Symmetry: D2
Subunit: 341 residues, 4 copies
Amino acid sequence: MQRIAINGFGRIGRNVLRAWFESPKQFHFEIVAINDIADVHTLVHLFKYDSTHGRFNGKVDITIENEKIYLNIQSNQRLLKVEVLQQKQPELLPWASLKIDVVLECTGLFRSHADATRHLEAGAKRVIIGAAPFDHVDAAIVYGVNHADVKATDQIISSVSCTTQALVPLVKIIDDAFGIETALMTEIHAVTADQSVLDHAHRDLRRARASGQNIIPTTSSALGALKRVMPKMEDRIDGYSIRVPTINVAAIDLTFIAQSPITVHHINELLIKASQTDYAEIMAVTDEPLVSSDFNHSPYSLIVDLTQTMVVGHQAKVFAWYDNEWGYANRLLDLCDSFKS
Amino acid sequence: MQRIAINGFGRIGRNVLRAWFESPKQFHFEIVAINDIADVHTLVHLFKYDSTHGRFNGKVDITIENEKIYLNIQSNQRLLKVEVLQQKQPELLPWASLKIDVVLECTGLFRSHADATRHLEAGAKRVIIGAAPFDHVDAAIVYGVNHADVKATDQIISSVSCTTQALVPLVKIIDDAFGIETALMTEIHAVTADQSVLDHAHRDLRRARASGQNIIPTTSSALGALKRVMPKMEDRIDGYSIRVPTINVAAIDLTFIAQSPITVHHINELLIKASQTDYAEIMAVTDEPLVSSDFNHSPYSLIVDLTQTMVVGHQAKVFAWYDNEWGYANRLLDLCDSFKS
Amino acid sequence: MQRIAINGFGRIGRNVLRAWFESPKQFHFEIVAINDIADVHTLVHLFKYDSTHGRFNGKVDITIENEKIYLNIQSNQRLLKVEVLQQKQPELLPWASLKIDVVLECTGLFRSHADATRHLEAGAKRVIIGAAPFDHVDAAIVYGVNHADVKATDQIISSVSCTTQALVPLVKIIDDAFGIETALMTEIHAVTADQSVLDHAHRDLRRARASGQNIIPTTSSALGALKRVMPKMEDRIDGYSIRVPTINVAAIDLTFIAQSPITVHHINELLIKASQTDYAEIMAVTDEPLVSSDFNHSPYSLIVDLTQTMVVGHQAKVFAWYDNEWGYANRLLDLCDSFKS
Amino acid sequence: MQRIAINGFGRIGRNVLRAWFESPKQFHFEIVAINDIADVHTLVHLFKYDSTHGRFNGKVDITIENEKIYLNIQSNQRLLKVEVLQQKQPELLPWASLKIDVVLECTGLFRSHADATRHLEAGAKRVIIGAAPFDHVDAAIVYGVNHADVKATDQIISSVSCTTQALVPLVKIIDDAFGIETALMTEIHAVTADQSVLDHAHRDLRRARASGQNIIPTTSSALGALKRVMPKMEDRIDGYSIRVPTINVAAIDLTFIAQSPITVHHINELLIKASQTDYAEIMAVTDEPLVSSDFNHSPYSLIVDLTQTMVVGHQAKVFAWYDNEWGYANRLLDLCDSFKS
Ligand SMILES: NC(=O)c1ccc[n+]([C@@H]2O[C@H](COP(=O)([O-])OP(=O)(O)OC[C@H]3O[C@@H](n4cnc5c(N)ncnc54)[C@H](O)[C@@H]3O)[C@@H](O)[C@H]2O)c1
Ligand SMILES: NC(=O)c1ccc[n+]([C@@H]2O[C@H](COP(=O)([O-])OP(=O)(O)OC[C@H]3O[C@@H](n4cnc5c(N)ncnc54)[C@H](O)[C@@H]3O)[C@@H](O)[C@H]2O)c1
Ligand SMILES: NC(=O)c1ccc[n+]([C@@H]2O[C@H](COP(=O)([O-])OP(=O)(O)OC[C@H]3O[C@@H](n4cnc5c(N)ncnc54)[C@H](O)[C@@H]3O)[C@@H](O)[C@H]2O)c1
Ligand SMILES: NC(=O)c1ccc[n+]([C@@H]2O[C@H](COP(=O)([O-])OP(=O)(O)OC[C@H]3O[C@@H](n4cnc5c(N)ncnc54)[C@H](O)[C@@H]3O)[C@@H](O)[C@H]2O)c1
């Protein structure tokens, strides 16, 4: 029985547990523990009531067996007994006792090999850092691209970021068919939980500004991460991100120079075929004039807007949507499932 | 001559300093110190650029002397030199060296008599807590109502809340004229800084919810504060507050039972006359069809919308706007200037 | 069976059709025609993709048959074949040939007795105006309160408004138990389809102003409508509405003077009982600390927040949420289902 | 004095008349009439109260002199007396009698050479179409690029769109220095008046969706318009616009392939020099970490953000903000001021 734990019951952490229950196909592993710096009642409330994704279709009841707190969660013909912890320092967590095989590190505060190892010290056998690498990782993984490159010896793993999980497939596909000389990316991202409601002191002066009333351009970890996953693309791609006042969903605007003839038709035909043959698990395409909120609660790593494709000579722009929250949470579960044989 | 400090350079603290320069009349005191846990660069940036009230019209120079940091601010033909500090523990602040007559406590974290006295220990002669009292205050003041009841011996003072500054004049005016059996308050409030961008752990489960996408009912400190200012109204006034996704500006909806004949005409007439005589300093009245944005950057403590006044039988409702940041800020200055004679 | 038509395929019209498919229990009537001044392609897209309630879970195909446009919709193990019209003038619609028994009038534009009769003088046996009455009507019905009073002579019926469906029960339940001398209503409502995106010319100078950036007080049709269902409440209740920048869901504050002794406990116990017995189909009660987005897609006509119930003296206030789109659409279908004999 | 008139008192028309008063240098023509299909009381109300730009810092007085409605405006030590009209059809306007020299045609309705000439056959000597040309024009101008290229025989002029006036200088400057082979544009743009509060039928299926809750990709007239100004760029530039839920201010992201060596330093130094010489009136450069709301009420056509300049190989991105209302209203005044002798 593969045993997963979630460190950090936040936007991702919560949507991992939900996605475990909502998946059409039951996963061959169990979440047995969650740890957050917050009280079980706050976590249960936030788990049940979600501004972005709606009420949880199920029932959650708290029990105090031993001096241990459990969540009894019943949804979609599925049940789970989940231990709740409240330990800010991850080396003190009982991962030995609970027989934890994988830890989903979803706090954002423990992204260095050092900080992550603290879970291994605490008894976990493997750690997935649900964010970009800070210093070193054993592997950097985009599910549906290179998840078969995980070695059994590998203990610290990054599932990079959602922006990375969308950008890489696009770049792999386009570069393989046509050759990317160079490329530049603009991400139009919804508000994130680290921003400010009103103008407020913050380590980053741009993200200190009122989230609901501003367009805020800012840096992206997706490019550092993409270079780890695809080394040959070093010095051939940069980009940045823009926060705008919506609650969820993002897009990528990839502009690239092609190394061979391109048309709008051949680009869209290539992506449709890729989505049908090699990337069907994680990639879709739409021909409809849709907007961000139409992709809310979509499980795909990317959905391409074929009506947005543009070519002027050698230069081209493609455009893809993704649910930064749900897309990534599904990929976390997809990845965990991949370790079993 | 009189030397003021500001502890907490946020939406209140920053708009206090701005209001001092912008005031059409020069105040007789000077602001000579500011403290926040953030660095001077972050403080200057946020002081200059504001999502709500625009670019600061003036020059801000930072002087790093050997040990001390100062701001040299020049605006509207006035100049201030302002020592800048970064001390989380208010008792370690150099209020003695700097000869601080009044400290404005604008952090939200030092509302007890104990915590306010920490400024007194640091050397300050008087504290004004910029919030409702938590336990004991030597006086609880609404400028324009009972600001004369400040005794020269009084060392810890509360300037109550924005909401209170507006609610009290309404209750006083109406109670004096018609008599209030009881009243109930609904406040519609722009978002505040303590809220959450996305759904996130927080000690209020209602304010944990995404600020930009929800109507959020919640408690008001204004009711306990009113009972300190007007003790006769204990057991006769209750109310609550609603957060909605605007950036600034609030409204108060007050529903009361009159103890003598009321009409719409009579209520409006009384409110107009008070804004023209006894409350001309802090109170205004419009009959124009306005909306929240129109009161952005108004200094008045309340602006009555007379078109909204209603009466059925012995029950009536009135309505008033206020700029929750600017009005409050102005009334802190107005209070500090009342201490002198 | 009974044949229903929808005139005006907007927020209400579209959600009526959606709620027919989504209903747990199949309605014993069919929707056989829709009419809008817009092209079928615009209408199908908007039907399929909704910013507020998500993707339509089902398939929509367009057919041309003898110059007639039909929509074949399949969902929830149900199918409808729905003829599509584009006639701005109700008198020229084919209600006689389509054998329409009931027209849902959802345009906003035909609320007068005389305008609504244009559907009758085009072949329809009965018209439900999906709004408060303009002048007069044969009946004004709130489902769950007085749907049984519909007579066969009632050919023009008003289903009033969202706000009225929520208010009338509240006022009825509480008047019957404790007695209401008088009452005043404050509605907090999400933005509506008739507002302006930016400050623009408009009939109402308040709804002229930017929908996404303002608190906007405004009139409410609810009180006129309530007085037409409960004529004894003439002179005993008034109120108004406040638009705030959320996409959907509304709340009502009712402040009343009781005529007998009251406490918070007795009020909540009465409202829980009513939600369990007489009003169970249309009314719920929550004790949890929830926010607006938690009631998106709720079918209830009101959900009381009992944590919000206040009492001071003989004066009380109760608070209730409703999904202003989904509730109202479900009450329309529920009303039509009440006609079968 | 030269005599200007405004058809369409909207976001542009209103800001034109404001910009007249607020401008630091006095303009050497007068605005002597405005027309709109809304009544004068509405026009004055929207002119005095703005959700974006705040209260008009002046006085407006309506006078009736002989069945002629006039506005008497005072602000910034200046005066105007402006006749107000309410004429739906331009050929019926009294331009001959009022001796109109230029009409600022700011309705969005009369962009054809045919529809603009209706104002010529009604008495005016010259017309400026305040938008991209629909069919053809005597000249398409970007003030500060080709405004010297107006011939006195030109009667139908276009001042293109906001976006065109940020894009064209960028393209000109860069192409001239480094050579542009091809380029693609992304515009991030605040909501405009033509959008939808909620999902509503609309000519454009993207702009039909809720303006306040969506990222909305859409077309841009700027690429048509730029090719009328610079025909050599046919087939070499393309792009699109994204609407996000802010109220004002846009940004342009321009990706180009340079025909010669480029660095970030060299690009930034070119744009700085230009902003200090030939483009000083319309262009500025910042390297501060600012956000959209800091450029509200900036008179410039574009403010380049240095920190955003990226180069990879031969491909490069640049980014520039503009106030899509104020920048444009000021360039319309600047256009009229250039005509004189
Ligand atoms: N939200 C997205 O769209 C998205 C997508 C991909 C990756 N990520 C990454 O996921 C990480 C978390 O993001 P999020 O949106 O969930 O943030 P969040 O703030 O919603 O969640 C963080 C959680 O960590 C908890 N926490 C804080 N300190 C802790 C500690 N010492 N031990 C345990 N729990 C602790 C917080 O209480 C909170 O519940 C970040 O690195 C972010 O970059 C986010
Ligand atoms: N904003 C309003 O409308 C309003 C109106 C009336 C009263 N108040 C009250 O005023 C107070 C200030 O809140 P705000 O709106 O300015 O929010 P805010 O978060 O902007 O203000 C808090 C500020 O205090 C600083 N701070 C935190 N810990 C500190 C410490 N130990 N020492 C010094 N500075 C510290 C923060 O960095 C920040 O700048 C609160 O009590 C609030 O409830 C606010
Ligand atoms: N949305 C709510 O919360 C709510 C609740 C209760 C009642 N209502 C009422 O329902 C009515 C409709 O409001 P809505 O929110 O659906 O607005 P809406 O603008 O979304 O719906 C109006 C629809 O009518 C169409 N239309 C306009 N003129 C027409 C004509 N001559 N013939 C046919 N179709 C025409 C429009 O194209 C559009 O599809 C209004 O009276 C409103 O007060 C709305
Ligand atoms: N807002 C921007 O960012 C921006 C920038 C550049 C160009 N423009 C263009 O300027 C034009 C005006 O747009 P806006 O933003 O001012 O929109 P708007 O809808 O606010 O302005 C249109 C105005 O014209 C009035 N009107 C309508 N029909 C009329 C008629 N027949 N005669 C007279 N007046 C009539 C309307 O009542 C309204 O006052 C559009 O073509 C727009 O694309 C807008």
